[PDB]
Ligand binder design. Structure first.
Ligand SMILES: C/C=C(\C)CC/C=C(\C)CCC=C(C)C
Lengths: 48, 970
């Protein structure tokens, strides 16, 4: 429902699978394949 | 043979006589299209005589008695009469062949229609859109085939070779098409149809291989698509199959046939192309053109032509088959006069039944209209029947073995002769181990530059009696300058183009020459489909030696040693003396060559020049623009010392200077129109300047060298050192598309300015420096070093900040995802259009663009990819695809043109709030001085809870919330 896409698109599974697949279609020429994934906010990232 | 095979042959004789030969004019031999259309089309006449030629061949393979000889002779001479009549139709227009030879304009083309009673012209040039390279090419192809089958002045031979030059440049010539209406929109717009290109390739092969393989490049790039404004044309069967067989890729032929079957084939034939509307009940019969808004109307109700199923029987006979389903499905023939099949031209959805057919595709019982019988289709029907019933063989209709195109051709071994320019050079080459022969020793074989070869062909085809002036000066690529030539009984070998072209900085770099040689060898190993083995003459000049002169360049040695080893350039190479290569070479014989501030007074300001060589040059633009070929008052002019400066910096090889001097002296690459024509030959558009849109002038069609060069100059807006970069990068892209075209997949509009900017950025982060000092060190790159940068740009090879770099690399290369354009077609059905930077991609485009067109692609890439910044664009690309992603779950449609940038930005404002809270430095987020998008957003990965595409999903949902008040999502 729209509210879920606005709030947390990723958790909802069906949509995430779509998001991850779209990430690859666009960017799998750059491919652990994890580079195309960002689950850390850059702060916990740039923490070390 | 008269027991049970002569009676059926006589039955087919009655068929051809009562359908085709009854209408042949005894004066001219031409065939009128129908009772209403009394004119004679070139292509229709050529195709309609195929049944007569096949019958004559049948009759002859069994001609022993007189009567049978009489019938065979009558049929063969009817074919000869028709072709001769078409010849005098073309011969009367020798002034048009000559004019089209140099200026390939639609107003200077051979007419398609001719008066069937006088071989004259019926309508004016302006009145039919006469440019149809396929008609002239099919005429030439079947003239070659009929002659090779035994069917017989030199003046008409000269005319035929001038026609070879006429159809020679068909890979870069816009056409009105096989359907003589240009593009689908139907506004008389000349367009490049693969049908014409393939037919021209077949005609040239049957009858210079450089333009042949240029046509081959067009075919590979365009297929399975027909042209720019056509997803698929059923006329492509005339290229991937009988009669051209111009595609040697079996997979490509199968894919084109499958596309035709899946998209155009219906219950009553195959539609010519999607949204054709030639005889649909929705068109205006008395209106010649088509408004862009009525092309939708033609969808799913296009007229199905039985003519194309004759092509599907012909292939199936040419290639053995149980496609006896294409036959037995042609029960849709008019009369069972007496019982004559009378193959119709097309079937149209009955008018009342438009809605049912639209909705339920290929299902309504259509009516036959148009020509009856379609003689072009009827002749192919009779020929296919003949061939299928055993009265004919593929080898009789095709004595030139055009059918054997699809067979894999083995790699060719390019014999190369390395020739020393001088004997000292030969001595150096030997100290290093390459045993060669000097150009003097190779006598009586005479080595000449490729310019001489191009000039020699200008004397081929000349009869001044009918005012025909040879062949236009065309640059001979590696393919042309790889055969040996027998000119006046002495063998002439010609060095490749890239050696004699020493007028731009590319030739000074020996690595460049190595790279050009490698590209030429890679092109040769793949594109040589000629009798003989190709021979590249590679003379080692004095410029190819090192600084001392007692040693050879390392790069040139290494290349020569690899060639001696058999492999260089993806090609197997045999090196040896040129004398050994005579017996196994394409020794073609050229028989036409046989004889028979303050103080504005610039009085004394150049006195400062009389040693840094940079400053000496710098002053020289003040003294050029302010004071270029003007005097210096020391027996010297501004141009002279700039040339002296150019030579000095070439000797010192400080490449920044050479480039600048070249830039202010307006040095231009001679084979640059070839580079642009090659890049456009592969269905890739080009844009030439820095990225804001007006400067970046797009190149949609080939351009002559003067225009191309002039377009480059005005795209720099006077800012020097990019106008040379445009040419150099264009050349490099041409070489890389000739050698590694996979690198150029998912790329359709090469932005040279964005490419240059991304090379500067890469030189800034690799060999870390300022972006500016890097923009200046990009000048100081060797031409081969810059080509390497471009390779690495394309392939994405590396020598927390990564994702910004990628977003930049892909955006500058204008790389789109696979299926991206078709996905954009899908959202345009939902929304009323997309808006990027205020420019609108309206949904009305889909009403005249089928999703798979390379004309809709261009429409999209002109509204989206125009974005200056490299990354903003790649984000706008994501926001479109997340719009595509969420359009499926969304069940409704919105009446707004969606502004993608906002979705990008709304995601931007959603990037500050989330990252600040998860808790990140406020200064960690930095806005862009060009796009206003946080740098960390670019650095973010696509997927994830904090991925950039997820933010756009949280943005598009928060964007269409006010447009779509309610969203019953799936
Ligand atoms: C169900 C709602 C969403 C998944 C939010 C994102 C979708 C849109 C904002 C509209 C998409 C529809 C188009 C025609 C583009």
């Amino acid at each position: 429902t729209r509210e879920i896409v606005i709030r947390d698109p990723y958790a909802l599974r069906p949509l995430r699978r779509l998001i991850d697949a779209y990430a690859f279609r666009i960017y799998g020429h750059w491919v652990n394949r994890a580079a195309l994934f960002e689950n850390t906010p850059k702060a916990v990232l740039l923490s070390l | 043979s008269r027991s049970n095979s002569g009676v059926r042959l006589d039955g087919y004789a009655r068929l051809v006589q009562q359908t085709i030969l009854c209408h042949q004019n005894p004066v001219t031999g031409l065939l009128p299209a129908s009772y209403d259309q009394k004119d004679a089309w070139v292509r229709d006449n050529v195709y309609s005589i195929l049944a007569v030629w096949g019958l004559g061949l049948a009759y002859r393979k069994n001609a022993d008695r007189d009567e049978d000889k009489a019938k065979a002779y009558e049929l063969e001479q009817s074919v000869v009469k028709l072709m001769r009549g078409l010849l005098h139709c073309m011969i009367r227009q020798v002034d048009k062949v000559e004019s089209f030879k140099y200026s390939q304009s639609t107003k200077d083309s051979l007419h398609a229609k001719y008066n069937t009673k006088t071989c004259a012209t019926v309508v004016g040039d302006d009145q039919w859109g006469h440019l149809q390279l396929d008609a002239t090419s099919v005429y030439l192809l079947f003239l070659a085939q009929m002659t090779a089958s035994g069917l017989h002045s030199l003046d008409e031979v000269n005319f035929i070779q001038n026609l070879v030059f006429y159809i020679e440049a068909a890979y870069k010539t816009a056409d009105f098409g096989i359907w003589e209406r240009g593009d689908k929109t139907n506004q008389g717009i000349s367009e490049l149809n693969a049908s014409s290109v393939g037919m021209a390739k077949a005609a040239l092969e049957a009858l210079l291989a450089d333009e042949v393989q240029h046509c081959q490049s067009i075919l590979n790039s365009l297929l399975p698509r027909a042209s720019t404004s056509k997803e698929v044309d059923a006329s492509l069967l005339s290229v991937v199959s009988f009669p051209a067989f111009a595609v040697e890729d079996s997979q490509l032929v199968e894919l084109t046939k499958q596309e035709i079957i899946t998209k155009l084939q219906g219950r009553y034939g195959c539609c010519r192309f999607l949204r054709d509307g030639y005889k649909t009940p929705k068109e205006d019969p008395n209106r010649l053109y088509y408004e862009p808004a009525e092309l939708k109307l033609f969808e799913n109700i296009e007229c199905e032509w039985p003519l194309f199923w004759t092509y599907f029987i012909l292939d199936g006979v040419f290639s053995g088959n149980a496609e006896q389903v294409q036959e037995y499905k042609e029960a849709l023939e008019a009369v069972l006069k007496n019982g004559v099949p009378l193959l119709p031209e097309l079937y149209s959805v009955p008018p009342d039944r438009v809605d049912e057919e639209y909705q339920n595709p290929h299902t309504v019982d259509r009516v036959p209209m148009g020509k009856l019988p379609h003689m072009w289709g009827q002749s192919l029907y009779i020929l296919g029947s003949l061939m299928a019933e055993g009265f004919l063989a593929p080898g009789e209709i095709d004595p030139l073995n055009r059918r054997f195109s699809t067979v894999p051709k083995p790699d060719v071994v390019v014999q190369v002769s390395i020739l020393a320019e001088t004997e000292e050079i030969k001595t150096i080459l030997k100290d290093k181990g390459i045993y060669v022969e000097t150009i003097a020793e190779v006598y009586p074989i005479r080595v000449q530059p490729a310019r001489i070869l191009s000039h020699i062909y200008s004397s081929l085809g000349c009869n001044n009696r009918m005012k025909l002036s040879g062949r236009p000066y065309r640059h001979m690529g590696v393919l042309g300058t790889s055969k040996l030539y027998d000119i006046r009984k002495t063998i002439f070998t010609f060095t490749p183009q890239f050696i004699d072209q020493q007028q731009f900085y590319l030739a000074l770099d020996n690595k460049m020459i190595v790279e050009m040689l490698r590209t030429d060898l890679s092109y040769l190993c793949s594109r040589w489909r000629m009798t003989g083995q190709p021979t590249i003459t590679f003379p080692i000049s004095h410029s190819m030696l090192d600084e001392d002169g007692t040693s050879l360049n390392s790069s040139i040695l290494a290349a020569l040693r690899k060639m001696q080893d058999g492999y260089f350039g993806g090609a197997r190479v045999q090196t040896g003396k040129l004398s050994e290569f005579l017996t196994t070479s394409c020794c073609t014989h050229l028989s036409f060559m046989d004889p028979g501030s303050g103080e504005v007074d610039f009085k004394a300001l150049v006195l400062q020049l009389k040693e840094q060589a940079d400053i000496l040059y710098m002053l020289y633009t003040m003294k050029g623009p302010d004071w270029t070929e003007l005097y210096n008052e020391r027996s010297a002019t501004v141009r002279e010392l700039l040339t002296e400066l150019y030579g000095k910096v070439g000797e010192i090889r400080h490449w920044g200077l050479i480039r600048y001097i070249s830039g202010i002296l307006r040095k231009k690459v001679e084979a640059l129109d070839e580079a642009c024509t090659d890049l456009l030959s592969h269905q890739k558009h080009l844009t030439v300047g820095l990225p804001p849109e007006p400067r970046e002038k797009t190149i949609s069609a080939p351009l002559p060298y003067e225009a191309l060069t002039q377009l480059i100059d005005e795209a720099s807006e006077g800012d020097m050192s990019i106008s040379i970069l445009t040419q150099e990068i264009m050349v490099y892209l041409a070489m890389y598309m000739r050698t590694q075209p996979g690198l150029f997949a998912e790329m359709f509009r090469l932005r040279i300015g964005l490419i240059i900017q991304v090379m500067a950025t890469e030189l800034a982060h690799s060999l870390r420096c300022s972006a500016e000092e890097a923009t200046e060190g990009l000048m100081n790159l060797s031409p081969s070093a810059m080509k390497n940068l471009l390779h690495h740009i394309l392939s994405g090879k590396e020598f927390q900040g990564q994702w910004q770099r990628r977003r930049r690399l892909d955006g500058a290369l204008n790389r789109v995802p696979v299926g991206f354009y078709q996905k954009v077609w899908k959202v345009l059905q939902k929304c009323h259009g997309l808006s990027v930077e205020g420019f609108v991609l309206p949904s009305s485009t889909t009403r005249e663009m089928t999703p798979g067109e390379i004309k809709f692609s261009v429409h999209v890439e002109s509204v989206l990819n125009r974005v200056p910044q490299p990354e903003y664009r790649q984000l706008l690309v994501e926001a479109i695809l997340v719009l595509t992603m969420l359009a499926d779950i969304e069940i409704h449609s919105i009446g707004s043109i969606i502004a993608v940038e906002k979705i990008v930005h709304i995601a931007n404002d959603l990037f500050l709030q989330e990252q600040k809270t998860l808790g990140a430095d406020d200064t960690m987020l930095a806005k862009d001085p060009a796009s206003g998008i946080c740098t960390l957003l670019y650095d973010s990965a696509p997927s994830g809870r904090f991925g950039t595409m997820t933010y756009l999903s949280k943005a598009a949902a928060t964007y269409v919330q006010e447009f779509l008040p309610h969203s019953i999502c799936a």
